[PDB]
Amino acid sequence: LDESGIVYIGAEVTGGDILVGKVTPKGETQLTPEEKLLRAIFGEKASDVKDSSLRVPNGVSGTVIDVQVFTRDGVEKDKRALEIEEMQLKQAKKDL
Amino acid sequence: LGDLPTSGQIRLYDGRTGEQFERPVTVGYMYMLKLNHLVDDKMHARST
Amino acid sequence: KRRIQPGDKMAGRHGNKGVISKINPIEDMPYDENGTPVDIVLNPLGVP
Amino acid sequence: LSPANGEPIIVPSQDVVLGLYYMTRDCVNAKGEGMVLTGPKEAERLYRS
Amino acid sequence: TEFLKPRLVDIEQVSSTHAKVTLELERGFGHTLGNALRRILLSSMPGCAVTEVEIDGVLHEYSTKEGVQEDILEILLNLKGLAVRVQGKDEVILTLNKSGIGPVTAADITHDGDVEIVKPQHVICHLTDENASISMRIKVQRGRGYVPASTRIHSEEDERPIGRLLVDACYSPVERIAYNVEAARVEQRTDLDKLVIEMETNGTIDPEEAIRRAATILAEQLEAFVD
Amino acid sequence: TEFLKPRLVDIEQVSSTHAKVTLEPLERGFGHTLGNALRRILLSSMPGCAVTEVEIDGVLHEYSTKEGVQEDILEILLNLKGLAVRVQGKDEVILTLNKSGIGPVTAADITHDGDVEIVKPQHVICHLTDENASISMRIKVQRGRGYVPASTRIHSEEDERPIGRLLVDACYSPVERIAYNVEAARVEQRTDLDKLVIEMETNGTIDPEEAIRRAATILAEQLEAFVDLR
Numbered sequence: 001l002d003e004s005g006i007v008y009i010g011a012e013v014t015g016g017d018i019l020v021g022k023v024t025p026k027g028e029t030q031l032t033p034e035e036k037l038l039r040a041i042f043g044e045k046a047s048d049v050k051d052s053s054l055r056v057p058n059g060v061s062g063t064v065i066d067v068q069v070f071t072r073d074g075v076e077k078d079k080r081a082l083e084i085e086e087m088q089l090k091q092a093k094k095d096l
Numbered sequence: 097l098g099d100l101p102t103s104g105q106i107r108l109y110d111g112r113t114g115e116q117f118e119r120p121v122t123v124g125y126m127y128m129l130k131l132n133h134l135v136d137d138k139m140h141a142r143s144t
Numbered sequence: 145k146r147r148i149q150p151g152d153k154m155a156g157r158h159g160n161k162g163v164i165s166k167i168n169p170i171e172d173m174p175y176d177e178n179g180t181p182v183d184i185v186l187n188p189l190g191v192p
Numbered sequence: 193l194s195p196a197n198g199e200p201i202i203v204p205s206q207d208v209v210l211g212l213y214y215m216t217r218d219c220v221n222a223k224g225e226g227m228v229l230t231g232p233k234e235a236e237r238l239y240r241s
Numbered sequence: 242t243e244f245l246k247p248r249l250v251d252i253e254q255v256s257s258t259h260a261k262v263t264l265e266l267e268r269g270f271g272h273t274l275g276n277a278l279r280r281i282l283l284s285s286m287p288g289c290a291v292t293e294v295e296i297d298g299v300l301h302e303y304s305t306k307e308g309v310q311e312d313i314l315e316i317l318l319n320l321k322g323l324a325v326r327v328q329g330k331d332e333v334i335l336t337l338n339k340s341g342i343g344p345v346t347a348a349d350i351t352h353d354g355d356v357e358i359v360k361p362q363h364v365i366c367h368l369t370d371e372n373a374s375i376s377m378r379i380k381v382q383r384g385r386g387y388v389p390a391s392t393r394i395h396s397e398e399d400e401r402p403i404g405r406l407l408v409d410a411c412y413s414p415v416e417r418i419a420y421n422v423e424a425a426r427v428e429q430r431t432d433l434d435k436l437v438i439e440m441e442t443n444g445t446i447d448p449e450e451a452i453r454r455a456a457t458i459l460a461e462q463l464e465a466f467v468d
Numbered sequence: 469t470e471f472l473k474p475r476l477v478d479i480e481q482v483s484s485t486h487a488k489v490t491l492e493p494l495e496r497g498f499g500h501t502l503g504n505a506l507r508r509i510l511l512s513s514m515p516g517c518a519v520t521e522v523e524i525d526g527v528l529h530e531y532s533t534k535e536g537v538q539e540d541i542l543e544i545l546l547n548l549k550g551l552a553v554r555v556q557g558k559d560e561v562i563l564t565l566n567k568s569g570i571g572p573v574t575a576a577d578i579t580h581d582g583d584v585e586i587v588k589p590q591h592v593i594c595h596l597t598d599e600n601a602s603i604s605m606r607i608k609v610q611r612g613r614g615y616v617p618a619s620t621r622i623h624s625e626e627d628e629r630p631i632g633r634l635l636v637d638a639c640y641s642p643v644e645r646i647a648y649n650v651e652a653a654r655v656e657q658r659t660d661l662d663k664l665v666i667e668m669e670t671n672g673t674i675d676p677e678e679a680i681r682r683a684a685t686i687l688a689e690q691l692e693a694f695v696d697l698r
Contacts, residue, residue, distance in 0.1 A: 127156065
């Protein structure tokens with residue numbers, strides 16, 4: 001993954017690999033006292049988010065050759081979409 | 097014109113033993129196609 | 145990329161279709177007087 | 193055996209039939225005509241050589 | 242420069258003249274070894290065999306004798322199937338004498354010193370009359386392979402003595418040789434061969450000795466290039 | 469007993485890739501056996517050198533293009549797959565290529581190496597079509613035998629590869645076509661002999677006599693197991 005949470009172009013991937021990282025709110029949960037005590041003993045903290053990343057389906061491999069990012073008008077663009085639009089602008093600039 | 101037999105059949109030899117096949121065999125060139133029915137997309141199994 | 149393997153479907157332009165059954169080593173293929181082998185072997189029984 | 197009529201259901205066809213038919217044909221002036229052999233093993237030995 | 246090495250895991254020994262040998266091989270080597278071994282075992286093994294016979298009162302293969310139920314064609318067939326191993330020269334002439342009633346066996350051939358008979362239970366003729374008798378001179382040369390009588394009579398440009406009967410010569414001690422190639426695997430290496438050889442021979446030698454002789458012949462044939 | 473053993477007699481050299489060999493003393497029936505065995509072994513088990521890895525500056529994957537280059541990366545890799553290289557003294561070497569200007573990029577442009585020889589310098593790799601275009605490659609050459617697909621080499625690995633290293637399928641065998649013939653010998657003492665003539669087609673990088681001797685050595689090493697007591 002890059003700094004934006006998106007896999008690099010040209011990476012070789014197989015089943016189970018993460019392509020786009022995403023987290024979701026999770027809310028309240030119920031745990032048995034034994035598992036809670038084990039978690040406390042191991043020292044890991046409790047988190048308020050749940051992994052909902054986009055993963056490669058099982059039985060599928062291949063190379064990443066293209067990535068497209070779409071954003072809402074109100075939302076501000078992230079770095080990678082900026083790079084894509086700079087590439088497009090460069091192509092148009094050469095053509096002109 | 098191509099210095100080839102006019103019957104279209106030649107003698108062949110078995111690669112595994114080197115013995116000659118008893119009758120002439122028609123040998124030539126034909127255009128072949130690969131269809132969109134791949135075993136990669138058709139094999140499937142399920143346990144539970 | 146997908147490479148051919150047993151189970152794939154091949155066909156010509158004359159309604160002759162079939163499924164690949166085996167990939168044969170080069171030294172096991174029939175060869176002619178000059179030693180050049182053949183690429184594909186088909187059953188002559190289908191034609192008549 | 194077929195459950196409908198009792199006839200055998202496994203019958204050789206296509207390449208097997210052609211192979212056996214070509215195996216069991218005879219020619220008038222074939223190479224090696226006229227010999228007397230001790231048995232089938234001698235016939236196989238003669239053919240393979 | 243490194244290849245898988247075979248090993249005779251099983252040698253199924255059925256009888257003194259029949260056995261099966263299995264070797265468990267690089268891809269494509271099973272056929273390469275089997276075809277060469279079969280060809281060498283068939284067309285190149287040397288040995289001794291009955292090659293000709295002289296029968297008194299018999300002029301040619303169409304002639305008919307009396308006192309023996311078997312025709313002379315059956316006599317020639319029985320003579321061709323006689324297995325003899327000779328310790329000595331390259332040409333021995335044998336004599337046979339039997340009179341009366343009963344089946345004449347190979348033991349009735351006079352014990353001619355160095356020449357040995359491996360199967361004294363072989364049958365040559367059957368005696369049906371007390372008056373009739375058979376006297377024959379059987380010669381045993383040495384050679385390799387199988388030689389039909391047709392090419393020998395075609396190669397007899399010199400004068401043939403009258404009453405000469407030619408019988409096919411089976412010098413090689415091999416009866417039947419066949420091989421089969423199967424599939425073998427080791428630690429997920431799937432494309433490997435397993436060679437099975439079926440061997441049959443006359444009582445002259447054991448099958449393993451014949452296999453070793455063929456292998457040694459091929460190896461000595463290849464000795465001029467192996468660096 | 470009366471076995472006239474074969475001996476290598478004559479080696480004609482028709483071209484850089486075409487040659488003939490002869491073994492004169494052969495008994496009846498041995499010619500076909502040795503011819504078939506040698507043909508199978510020569511076609512199956514000869515060693516050679518082939519390209520296995522390519523790295524190109526400013527290229528991330530093979531499904532891309534390069535400015536000023538008329539060919540795709542896939543076509544360049546396919547062209548490199550047919551490169552004939554002879555390596556002496558080591559089983560692994562890395563070559564480098566640099567070129568600029570307008571014109572074809574042939575095998576002669578590879579940087580010279582002390583113990584690496586390029587058999588065919590006219591093998592075209594790619595073409596440049598811009599005056600400012602430039603290319604730089606690092607080509608890895610290994611030694612082996614058989615056919616090893618890259619999709620199988622990825623399986624046999626325990627350390628990750630960086631982005632930009634392009635794998636290439638390896639065809640190690642240097643022999644394309646083998647044809648043999650059996651003809652009667654000219655020994656006056658024995659008019660029942662015959663000679664074996666073997667015709668070879670290669671890509672260079674191999675000597676016919678060495679190939680024949682290696683095939684004979686492999687066959688003898690295989691027969692050693694049959695020769696022994698079991």
